[model samples]
Target chain A: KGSIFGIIGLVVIFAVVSFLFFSMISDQIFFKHVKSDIKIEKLNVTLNDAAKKQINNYTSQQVSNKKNDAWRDASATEIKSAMDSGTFIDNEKQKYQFLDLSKYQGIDKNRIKRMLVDRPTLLKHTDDFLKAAKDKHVNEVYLISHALLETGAVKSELANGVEIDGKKYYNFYGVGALDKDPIKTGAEYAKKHGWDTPEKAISGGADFIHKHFLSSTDQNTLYSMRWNPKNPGEHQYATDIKWAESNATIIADFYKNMKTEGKYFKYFVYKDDSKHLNKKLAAALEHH
Target chain B: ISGFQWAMTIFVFFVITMALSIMLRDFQSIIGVKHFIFEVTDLAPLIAAIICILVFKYKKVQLAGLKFSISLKVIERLLLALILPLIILIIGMYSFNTFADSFILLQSTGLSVPITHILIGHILMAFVVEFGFRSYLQNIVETKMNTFFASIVVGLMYSVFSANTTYGTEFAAYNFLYTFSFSMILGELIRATKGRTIYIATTFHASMTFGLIFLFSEEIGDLFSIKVIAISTAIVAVGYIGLSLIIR
Candidate 1:
């Protein structure tokens, strides 16, 4: 009798918990979609500012770890080993651990095509991105990939576009200039940067990455800007924890498709860095 | 039934209740909306209790260790259950405030919720968890094994099941340690109160949670400091020695 009862009890217990769990989530989603008595996010459910700040910086600080000499040396040396298999001093790979673009002769239009959920939006701006990179000294492949990644290949809350002051705008970079409505948050980011068109969003996003992140030697890699290697407490980009690594990983997969020959498992190399004939020891002064 | 079979029945019952909670979790993880409900886990005990009454028809299976009484002996034990956990939790929270930048302060609230509504939720939560952990689970387990062994098992189970319900990741391990030890004290209260321990335990749980949610914050103490751990462990150990003395 107890055995049968306990079994029945377990099933219902499982069912009810699952039901409440789903219902609470559905409520939060509904509350997010419209407005409700509960603003669940408003709950101070997270750690305090001091704790949060510590965790936010933890990933990058741990990535370019200063404490463990072995880890720092191994990771830094790993960057060199990646380059010895390819040509040129790939600064982007050193910082971000991204796929190298130099070994690839051309872009894989299909690989980039796979990145987009809404293809037409980004495809409309490919020429402008290519042209924007011409003078800016950024790679066409990286510029395209970064925009796709931020907008989730132009399909998330940002890529979908939002209305503000009765005009619609979009931010492909997912730059968070937030509003009470998350839609308006994306819109505010677009409007601030004048990303009113697909062309402007792509071109503007590339320049934003260039001037802000890639402009300085200290801010060269996706890792440096997102992770902030040199400065432990201070960060250069919006903190999504593993923002650089996540973007670089996706960019690596996409950039590799551009390679017809050997695997391009690293980020790009600027021409000026090719001045170093020895790839292994070239990044010593750059990273450390 | 042999002692081992009875123990198996108790454990099997315990597993179903605790296991159901873990199995049903983390669908919210798939399409994560940040700051969502981290702990719908307390529902596990309530669901199992209802099942026993309606299906297996062994309403007494869970209530086996609990005997209905309102004697002074029961009252004294209940009072201890209520006051002791509150004091231990206070010491733990105080340590967090004293040494760490975090205090037991549950945090500033912005959502316009009536205090009564929040109060009701807290009360229900406290009642539900205690009923499940103490009356429903621990009481039954004690029927088969020694009370001391039962309390340890129940304490460990309660801690593991309840661990991930809060956004206490920074001190998750410490919270487990605190929760586990306090629940052991609660298990002992089952014997002390003769099944009246659930209400007092519920009261203690609710008070600790809401006292922090609405009125308190730990500003400067770490939950894992040797001072905090030693203070808490000493309290648990002393309670065990004192409670067992009643048997003496």
Candidate 2:
């Protein structure tokens, strides 16, 4: 019967196709581990001229006054322990110093996904943050930190997007969200901005941050951006007095686990801040 | 045979398959050949079906629904089966308003995969799946229950069985829901065609798989969401209406 021959042919075809299909699937899913034949040129981070100038001009007055800075009195032994255990506050500061915000750091997007896989909404669009950051010339770590802070670790209703009149809109950074009518206003703002996708919202939010907070040299650092030493109490990023510090805390947390090879760093100092800045930077950078 | 025996058979099949799959996956990870032999996991159901044939001393392979004959009527149905997936795709794409963008995305990636590979690969994949689930499992289940309930049971079992072999989290949920919907459609096809469902089922399955890859690329997590599944179900409902009219 032809059925016998047909069956044999089917088996052979099945074996070949099954091999190809499963091979492709495996490559897609486990691309993180597989060494590819294509040698990718990774983007290198160079500390730009503006950052170099800021570092050179760094006097003790540039650092915002530390209000009840507990780490100031911490002993060397405690600092060492904290640094070793990944509990050090100063690692964040040191990491921030080396961050050249203007350049795109070649971040491992898969690593970002793995880091936030527990936060499902954020995990789905972790690569979008990198893309957005690259497009808008903002620091990816800082941008993601801002998103995490704004969206309650990307679990907030706004981050999930709201649908109005048959159109969906996401507000990852809580832009244009007035406290009085937070959800409605944020959705309206997202609609106005045409942030219909997570990608759009991330890129749009990054553009907004770049224009408002990272445009000027003085506003480069989160502390300077929030506190605004040039014009105190005006154009601050958030109403919270400790907004910059809070953002920095998240930025630093991500950097602790991130790769920083070939990336340049710059340290900021205030007029009376030698003791705090130097010791913290020394303790943190030592581990790196 | 009692439902208890059926359940045990299913359970033992999964246990053996899952255990073997886990070991093979570990070996693949160590060897770094990712998918070559790991695809044997997908054939576990076929192996299970073969075991049933020997153990039960099934008199003919045709009892397992392995009939292979072609006629004008069969050809017509096969053509319709191939077209049905296109209908699902058109409505699904329009429903999501992602026609243009998804095509662009596919153009960037999916076209690189040869057309022959897409057709032959997906068709064979569908044949394997349909042969095991519909040919063997559904027929066995239908011995006890009505066609409707047998379909549901087999659909659920297929979904759960696949979960061990496939990816996890939201993707797993998506696969479960989509596979259940698809299995129900194939069940209806079996009922309408009187056990000659293999040809139409494989054709339909291959076409859908092809359309999905063409429209959304291999990474189709977002495309086959709950909305898409719902759209597909409604479209297939319409297909059934047409089928009934033709049969009448």
Candidate 3:
């Protein structure tokens, strides 16, 4: 028993001594550790054809809106500056935050209820959402509808929260999704703001949009970023060709439901590919 | 428990744990997926334990004494078991560093990973392996011979097993030495308490592993020179001599 106690004492002593020994050596090593000297070169970036098209579309629509009003005083590109300044939508806002005023043109708002059924949770906090959006100086209904489109109407894990620093945080904009890794990127955004609540997440998203995409330099709208109607290769948003088409469809529904006015001048456009010089049949006709 | 019985029980454990690990590692290689490999191997030890318990039979499983003991003295004793290997390593590093400056520093590959992954990865495996290697294997070996002789057999097997953890790495040499020395410590802990000390050893094993994979990981590239390795080996060999006499 005595020897056993002695052996145990010796082992305990050894462990403490060695643990310190290791800790010291590690302290020394890490203290003197060489820097990971990685070098990187300057990178130039450009908007893709799709992204540029959308930005051009906004500027063009602004020009179109301006031209139809009184005069063709300016080009479409200059109208983008007006659109970004918030005046481009001033005339349209006076008439409707709801839908197409033309009876023959836009999508019906009555059909949006079916879209909402697939995504039930999107309607959860509208009173706060309205207040929040108003505070952010953005159309509250606009973002709510966009959130639905991005989050599959709050059905996606991205909307509910993907795992961040261990817990999930909502990211309706799919802000982390600019990279291929949605889970990792979404988690990063969740952590950066500590946005544990839906209110903070949506609000944070509005801030991101204003600062990064809607700032003076970027001043891009879905039409400008997605359709590129003015300057075909200018600052745009997403790369998907159908980006404008899809969001425009959802915006129409949200607007229709709003039913704010009878005379909405939302310039809904699909870039006319039919105006191209010739089809395969035209080539055949040319030879004949 | 005859020597043949000890061999067969170890054989069963070796086949199940080793085979499944090999199979899954192969799957990771062929499919070229990395994350699933961690998830899959996490279950390997549990699966091995379940099968091992059946092979060892239901009644003999009680011989493991895995339950937390009421005695605080057991806790104290297990902690001693925990640090015994560290003492040997401290002695090794100090004496070895004297021979060459290179022994004090090392060079090479590093697993630059977060500590969370290390702790979560090793805990359960520690429990299952300590059960198999210390409680079960040492117990069987003890039944055939004395505790000192039994620790030698089990310790050497465990040393070899430890080398496989960081296989092909330059530090594999030290991994074997320390695991052998450390595992001998665990065997003695098991022998001292018979079937009653497995949890203590498991806790010790898990924490030490957490240390080895995380805190001590970075120092390896700077600390594991061949001179240091040789000196550490010499110390381990001498410690091996001390081990048989320490308890016996």
Interface RMSD over true interface Cα atoms for each candidate: 16.9, 9.7, 17.9
**Which ranking of candidates, highest TM-score first?**
2, 3, 1
Per-residue lDDT over B1-248 for candidate 1, one digit per residue giving the tens place of the 0 to 100 score: 24664565556656777777776565335423221222355667766655553544456555654455555555555445445544555565445434532221222224455566666777777887777777777766676677778878877887777674354565666667667776666666556455566666676677656654553322223345534754565576576658667766
Write model 2 residue lDDT over A157-259, tens digit each, in one string.
9889887989889998888888887778888999998899888998898999888767876556554454344444355555343344455556666755442
Q: So what's the TM-score on candidate 3?
A: 0.40
How would you encode candidate 2's per-residue C-alpha lDDT over B1-248 as one tens digit per residue? Answer: 66666666556655654565555554545532223222445556666666666665334532656556664444455655644565566555554434222221243242555566556666676787677778777777776787678878887877776663244576666666777777777676666454566797788777776667655453345534444654576558556755755876
Candidate 3 wrong stretches, greater than 4 Å: A1-288, B1-7, B27-46, B88-117, B164-175, B219-248
Interface residue Cα RMSD of candidate 3 after superposition: 17.9
- Which DockQ-derived CAPRI band holds candidate 1? incorrect
lDDT per residue, candidate 3, B105-145, as tens digits? 22212345554565665666577677767766666667667
TM-score of chain A of each: 0.47, 0.56, 0.45
TM-score of 1: 0.39
After superposing candidate 1 on the true structure, give the runs of residues whose Cα lies further than 4 Å from its correct spot: A1-288, B1-5, B23-39, B52-62, B65-69, B102-111, B165-172, B215-247
- In candidate 3 chain A, what residue range of length 10 has the lowest lDDT sum? A34-43
* Residue-level lDDT tens digits of model 3 in A186-242: 757767887787778777876675566545322234555443334444565644433
Candidate order by lDDT, decreasing, is 2, 1, 3
lDDT of 1 by residue, A192-212 (tens): 878777667766776776776
